[PDB]
Design a protein around this nucleic acid. Structure first.
Lengths: 117, 151, 51
RNA sequence: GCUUGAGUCUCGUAGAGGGGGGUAGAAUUCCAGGUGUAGCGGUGAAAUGCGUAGAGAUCUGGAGGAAUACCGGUGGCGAAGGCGGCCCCCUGGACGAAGACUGACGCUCAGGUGCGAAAGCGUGGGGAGCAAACAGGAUUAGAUACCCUGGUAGUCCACGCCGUAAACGAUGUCGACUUGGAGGUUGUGCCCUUGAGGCGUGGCUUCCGGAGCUAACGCGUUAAGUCGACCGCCUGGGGAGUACGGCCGCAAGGUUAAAACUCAAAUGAAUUGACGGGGGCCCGCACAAGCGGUGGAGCAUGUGGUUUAAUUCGAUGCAACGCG
């Protein structure tokens, strides 16, 4: 179906969850998979293992497109992200670019207070 | 074990088959320091195991014990103020030690007549891996398979 | 930010992000505007950097 | 009168000094649209919350507000509060080089006047994020908290008020003298500049230390050393920086400022120890790895209690309870 043959893997690692979205070069999503949607709810959805099985599961569900090349775009910090791109070249993809696209303000908005734990 | 790294003591092999593996199996089975009784039970039970399966003695034992050896097991950490059940790879001596402990314990659980029949039927139920010790191995492997996310 | 490589490639080896963004810069902008704790955190950081 | 104090002029230097105006780029939120699909978010774990009315992720376009990553530095400037993108306009101070000029014009300062973070107040705007109050979810014995999800005043602008802070180098201002070392920053002079050098001479500043001082801790040419001038303030702890009165303030409150009564201490610095849900290193059947028990049953024996005429006395966390 529609046979795009090149895409972008936007991986959005945060501290609590990694969410991998495989799209095309136009930016239209072709299929996604989160670490929290792969079993292991909770303290286990923020691990490199959960991110890699999230990326394995996002490599599935884009078989209908015949993607061979993809760029990787990485957001946020997280226990994910590093393992995530590994799972992508464990799934036959030719990984072309690895950009880190974490949003950094140039002293913009005030961050929240928190955490007197 | 706080300081002292240790050696280990050498067990005498089995007086019928020369197997230190099976010698440790009669030590796992032994209760109250009665070794003669336990080796009688092991010789009777493995003798009917060799007669039933028709293979031989200690390769029927080695198959029936090969189906119950754990691969990896969970283990508590308590490092970050939390209780984790991490999976960890079992050492070979601990591997077959756990194998024998589960066979013997499951054989004590059974409801047959004599201990040689309970353990002969437990090793026979472990030869086609359908007994209780294989459910203990699958249980351990479900715990270490569910919690795979910690390594 | 980008990396690419020709066909002799095996490993990610992108330690461009142990250079700039990941470790410090995003973990710093998770928490409060002070003016006060940074003046003392930098004061004791430059007072610790001593022989 | 005089120039060694103070000041003026010439030429430059560095600077987040101030006020006004403009603009730029990242990011957050919102709105509209494309793809796409079952979760997202959150936590120690959860739940509230958002989500098949299509969220989160992702791309495009727009709006708006605030703050200005990197440079960034015990770096700089300012009397202090404080001041951080870039550009323009108006403007204050400092420092340096040589020379000229005035000629003690100086120092401090009670009352007085001005400036004075943040929160707060008034009027009018603005309102993206954050967030007192507030609401819900948790946690808990309780939880009017810490944690989570939302969230209003406020934070932002204009003008006025307030007038305070651990407004702190807890160190008033001005001047003079008194061994050193390593830096930072900003000038300037000289020498083959034979380079990212060598030798000096100023301004500001950081760390360590000598004499000296100090209760000690420490300060140590930027003094808490050695002196001089003027000011401010102190006189045991509490009551109390409170009440009354005055002045100020829209208010909140600010400032000035007692007494009765009560205690024989309150305090500073340092020492020894003990302790810590502080840190480092180390041990023991301490935990872990195992095996067998106890707690359940009947009996033995000891104890508490009860009973009794008496149920002899003693032992009572560990280290009393088949103990004397």
């Amino acid at each position: 179906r529609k046979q795009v043959s090149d895409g972008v893997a936007h991986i959005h690692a945060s501290f609590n969850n990694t969410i991998v979205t495989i799209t095309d070069r136009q930016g239209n999503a072709l299929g996604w998979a989160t670490a929290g949607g792969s079993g292991f709810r909770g303290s286990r959805k923020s691990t490199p293992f959960a991110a890699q099985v999230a990326a394995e599961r996002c490599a599935d569900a884009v078989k209908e497109y015949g993607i061979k090349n993809l760029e990787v775009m990485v957001k946020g910090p997280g226990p994910g992200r590093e393992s995530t791109i590994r799972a992508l070249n464990a799934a036959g993809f030719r990984i072309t670019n690895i950009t880190d696209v974490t949003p950094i303000p140039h002293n913009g908005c005030r961050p929240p207070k928190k955490r007197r734990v | 074990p706080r300081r002292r790294v240790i050696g280990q003591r050498k067990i005498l092999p089995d007086p019928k088959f020369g197997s230190e593996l099976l010698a440790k199996f009669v030590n796992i089975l032994m209760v109250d320091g009665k070794k003669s009784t336990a080796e009688s039970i092991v010789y009777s039970a493995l003798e009917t195991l060799a007669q039933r399966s028709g293979k031989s003695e200690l390769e029927a034992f080695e198959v029936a014990l090969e189906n119950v050896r754990p691969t990896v097991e969970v283990k508590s950490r308590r490092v970050g103020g939390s209780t984790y059940q991490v999976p960890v790879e079992v050492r070979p001596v601990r591997r077959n030690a756990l194998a024998m402990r589960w066979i013997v314990e499951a054989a004590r659980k059974r409801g047959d007549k004599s201990m040689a029949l309970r353990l002969a039927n437990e090793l026979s139920d472990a030869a086609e891996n359908k007994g209780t010790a294989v459910k203990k191995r699958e249980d351990v492997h479900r715990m270490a398979e569910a919690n795979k996310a910690f390594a | 930010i980008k990396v690419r490589e020709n066909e002799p490639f095996d490993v990610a080896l992108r330690r461009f992000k142990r250079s700039c963004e990941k470790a410090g810069v995003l973990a710093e902008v998770r928490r409060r505007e002070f003016y006060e704790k940074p003046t003392t955190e930098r004061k004791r950081a430059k007072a610790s950097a001593v022989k």
